[PDB]
Amino acid sequence: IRMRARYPSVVDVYSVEQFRNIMSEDILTVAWFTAVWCGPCKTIERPMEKIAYEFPTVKFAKVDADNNSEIVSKCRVLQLPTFIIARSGKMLGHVIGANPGMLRQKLRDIIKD
Numbered sequence: 001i002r003m004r005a006r007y008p009s010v011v012d013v014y015s016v017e018q019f020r021n022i023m024s025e026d027i028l029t030v031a032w033f034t035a036v037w038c039g040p041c042k043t044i045e046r047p048m049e050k051i052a053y054e055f056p057t058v059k060f061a062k063v064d065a066d067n068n069s070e071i072v073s074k075c076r077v078l079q080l081p082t083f084i085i086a087r088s089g090k091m092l093g094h095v096i097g098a099n100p101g102m103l104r105q106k107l108r109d110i111i112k113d
Contacts, residue, residue, distance in 0.1 A: 002027065002059065008052045008053045008055075008056045009049070009052055009060075010032065010048075010052065010060045010061065010062040011059060011060065011061050011062065012061075012062050012064075013031075013061050013062060013063045013064075013068060013071070014067070014068070015068075016068075016070050016071055016074070019031070019061070019063070019068070019071050022059070022061050023061075023086045023089060024088065024089045025059075025087075025088070026087065026088045027057075027058075027059050027087065028057065028058045028059070028085070028087045028092075028107070028110065028111070029058065029059045029060075029061060029085070029086050029087060030058060030059070030060050030061065030083050030084070030085050030103070030107070031061050031063055031075070031083065031084040031085075031086070032048065032060055032061065032062050032063065032081060032082075032083055033063050033065055033072065033075075033077045033080055033081060033082040033083070033084075034062060034063070034064060034065065034080055034081045035064060035065045035066050035080050036064070036066070038080050038081070040080070040081060040097065040098040041080050041081045041098070043098055044081060044098045044100050047100040048060070048100060051100060051103065051104055051107075054104075055104075055107055055111075057111075058107060065077070065080055079096065079097065081097065081098055082094065082095070082096055082097070083095040083096075083103050085106065085107070085110065092110060093106055093110070
């Protein structure tokens with residue numbers, strides 16, 4: 001289930017357990033690793049808001065790297081921003097760096113097929 005009556009936008013991730021529960025759900029999900037004082041991360045904020053609006057069947061889970069360092073380590077995230085795509089606990093792909101167009105293309109192709 002997802003929350004009803006919600007503007008399509010990120011869910012903020014605050015714990016290792018919450019992250020596991022999120023990524024284990026049967027919902028196509030994108031974990032978005034980011035940090036406040038990161039230049040490339042800031043550039044893609046608005047593009048990401050548009051992606052969340054345009055893909056309302058996808059959940060976008062924002063993981064701040066400075067506050068969730070154990071999630072960063074579990075997922076072997078090496079640079080920011082990074083996107084990891086999953087559904088029902090299964091790894092479906094990743095996009096490295098400030099590449100929202102590649103993320104959009106990857107989501108389109110997962111949904112199509």
